[PDB]
Amino acid sequence: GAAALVGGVLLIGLVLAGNSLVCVSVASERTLQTPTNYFIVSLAAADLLLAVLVLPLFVYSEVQGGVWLLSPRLCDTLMAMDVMLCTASIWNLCAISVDRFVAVTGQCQLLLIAATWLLSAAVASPVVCGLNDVPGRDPENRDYVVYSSVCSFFLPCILMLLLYWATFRGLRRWEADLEDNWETLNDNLKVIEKADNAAQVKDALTKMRAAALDAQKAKDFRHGFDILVGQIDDALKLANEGKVKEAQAAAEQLKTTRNAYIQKYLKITGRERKAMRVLAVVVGAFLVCWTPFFVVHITRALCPACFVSPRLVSAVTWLGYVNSALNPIIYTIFNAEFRSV
Amino acid sequence: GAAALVGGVLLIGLVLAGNSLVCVSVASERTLQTPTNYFIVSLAAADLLLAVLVLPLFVYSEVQGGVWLLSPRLCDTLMAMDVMLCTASIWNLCAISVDRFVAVTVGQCQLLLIAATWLLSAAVASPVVCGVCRLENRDYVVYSSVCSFFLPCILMLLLYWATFRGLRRWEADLEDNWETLNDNLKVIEKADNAAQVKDALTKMRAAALDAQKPEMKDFRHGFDILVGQIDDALKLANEGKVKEAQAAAEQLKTTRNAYIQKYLKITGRERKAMRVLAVVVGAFLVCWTPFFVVHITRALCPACFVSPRLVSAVTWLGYVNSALNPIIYTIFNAEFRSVF
Ligand SMILES: Clc1ccc(N2CCN(Cc3c[nH]c4ncccc34)CC2)cc1
Ligand SMILES: Clc1ccc(N2CCN(Cc3c[nH]c4ncccc34)CC2)cc1
């Protein structure tokens, strides 16, 4: 019976302690404050707000079985608060995964959070006096629940889908433009070690120094790229002077040098691959826990003579609010970048 | 029950004593005009207003027996005054915590904050115009109990843990620079060729500048002094002279282990300036928590017993914080502690 009591108090306690640390970490440290992390702070503070203006009163309503006792104005304020807060969290996800496009030329990160917070209100603000004191309310409204289920769920869902697909395509294009140089350098070194005349080593060193500039597309990565370019130019000069017998040893030293930075560059490669993975994980948790919710909230409201399942309604509400405590868990146990506890 | 009025009169007298003492100390020191004490003026004003416009008539009622013979419109005016002042006190405590956290995290942008503080204190006291003389409302009661206590309490708690974490990070960064300079100086004492000296001295300069983040100026004067001495050593070293690197490193080590005394004194001063925040916010919570908890409970649990003795006790407990906060400000921090 009172399964919502224990579960509710555990959820509210671990969401009070959950997103609060995400706010105490950024505003304290300086090496971790980024516009991405500022968006994360806005998102977590949005989840911290829902833990008090909705969760306790929602749980107390669920204790009586869902039967409301106070007037209509208080219930309308609490419901509009919940709509604004969920819309704000999902549009904070929107702004976060929009800022996660480093392929763009500090920045005006104010506008994203501001528009998120404004449309969160603008979509949830017009309560029109609880639908104009609709008659026989006794103890949600048409043509507005549909609006707050489309503009607050479906549209940001397609936004997340578009953003992750664009991220996939962009990272694949970046790694392809890098793999071009990856293969050209090996082919040219092989040619140098197997050439026949002074022009073949020259062409191989040309194509080697050619691929050196196509990789400039994005601190210690600078000091590494400046030492081997001089060696490549020395090898090019030696090959220009008809010194293949010396260009071979030059290429041996060049391989021994560049393979020293290979092992430092692949770490950054895996660095960003894991970042994209954790982004996908955050969006996937959002979907997992808020899809059955808004699916029910749109279908049962649009499908009258179809089963709605009261138990399913309460369960999808509990799941959607479990998401509110899932995103600060993902930046915690699923992601190891937030070392400051 | 004569002891009730005795305690009430003593509490009113001590509210007057504490807040008027804050006022007189501000008006007789001239060195208290700092952002730390900038908010205490609003606190003293709000507490004196609570002790003149509520507490006399509040105790009138409390000794009358809760009957209240006053017209319900004057009752609503007094209730609005009490809401406004109890809201202004808590919002100004939140603003104190805000100022502390911002001073930890980074001119005069607190006038807007105090103006909004008192404006919102008035905004929560307006629906009493359209509302026994208790909080005779259900929807409004929860609203005022939530927006005026349940929000600022957790907000200042979060800001206070943020102050703790930021101060710990500042401490850790400066201790890291300390040990980095220790290691680099122990290296230069034993350095061999000149390129290693150049690299290590670049490292030392980088650490010295990375640490650079009435007496806060005397700490930075040693910063630029050490920077200029590192520049001296770097010139004498890149000129191809190894012994002069150590010659300058001797005085650099002297300056380094000399500034640490003032650094640790500053760390102790910051810890002491945060402990007063701890005590103040903790006492405020202890005093003003059960009142609003029982209020929101009685507003959420109608057919649930709330004895009026609880009402009187928690109201006295709430007013105890308005009595105590100037005393707590005077006991801690050496501005008022060393004068008296
Ligand atoms: Cl008697 C009673 C008392 C309180 C409540 N609560 C109010 C807040 N909630 C509304 C809500 C949660 N998620 C949403 N998503 C989109 C649109 C609306 C919502 C639901 C729970 C419900 C019944
Ligand atoms: Cl029969 C009777 C007669 C007079 C009173 N008084 C009215 C003014 N007071 C209201 C009050 C105290 N703290 C608050 N915090 C937030 C909001 C309102 C308040 C309490 C004392 C009470 C009962």
Residue numbers in the entry:
A (entry chain A): 31 to 135, 144 to 177, 183 to 218, 1001 to 1043, 1059 to 1106, 304 to 378
B (entry chain B): 31 to 136, 144 to 168, 179 to 218, 1001 to 1042, 1056 to 1106, 304 to 379
What does the paper say about this structure?
To facilitate future pharmacological studies and possible improvement of related compounds, we determined the 3.5 Å resolution crystal structure of mouse DRD4 (66% identical to the human DRD4 in the whole amino acid sequence and 89% identical in the transmembrane (TM) region) in complex with L745870. To aid crystallization, we replaced the long, presumably disordered, intracellular loop 3 (ICL3, that is residues A2205.70–A3026.24) of the receptor with a thermo-stable variant of apocytochrome b562 (BRIL). The crystallized recombinant DRD4 protein contained four additional point mutations, F1213.41W, P2015.52I, P3176.38A, and C18145.51R (superscript numerals refer to the Ballesteros-Weinstein numbering system; Ballesteros and Weinstein, 1995). Moreover, DRD4 formed a non-symmetrical dimer in each crystallography asymmetric unit. Here, we describe the binding pocket of DRD4 on the basis of L745870 bound to Mol-B. This antagonist was buried in the upper part of the TM core underneath the signature C1053.25-C18045.50 disulfide bond. A proton-titratable amine group exists in the core piperazine on the arm side of the heterocyclic ring, and formed a hydrogen bond (2.9 Å) with the acidic residue, D1123.32, conserved in all members of the aminergic receptor family. The heterocyclic ring of L745870 resides in the relatively hydrophobic orthosteric pocket, surrounded by V1133.33, F3306.51, and F3316.52 from both sides, and by C1163.36 and W3276.48 from the bottom. The chlorophenyl arm of L745870 was observed to protrude into an extended pocket of our mouse DRD4 structure, which is also present in the human DRD4 structure. In particular, the ligand-binding pocket of DRD4 extended from the orthosteric pocket into a crevice between TM2 and TM3, rather than a crevice between TM2 and TM7 as observed in the D2 and D3 receptors. Furthermore, by reducing the moving freedom of TM3 required for full activation of class-A GPCRs, the bulky chemical group of L745870 inserted into the TM2-TM3 crevice may provide a structure basis for its antagonist activity.
Dopamine and its receptors play fundamental roles in controlling neurological processes including motor control, cognition, learning, and emotions. The dopamine receptor family, which belongs to the G-protein-coupled receptor (GPCR) superfamily, can be divided into two subfamilies, namely the D1-like subfamily (including dopamine receptor D1 (DRD1) and DRD5), and the D2-like subfamily (including DRD2, DRD3, and DRD4). DRD4 is characterized by its more selective expression pattern in the brain, and thus exhibits promising pharmacological properties. Although dopamine is the most potent endogenous ligand known to activate DRD4, the receptor is also readily activated by epinephrine and norepinephrine.
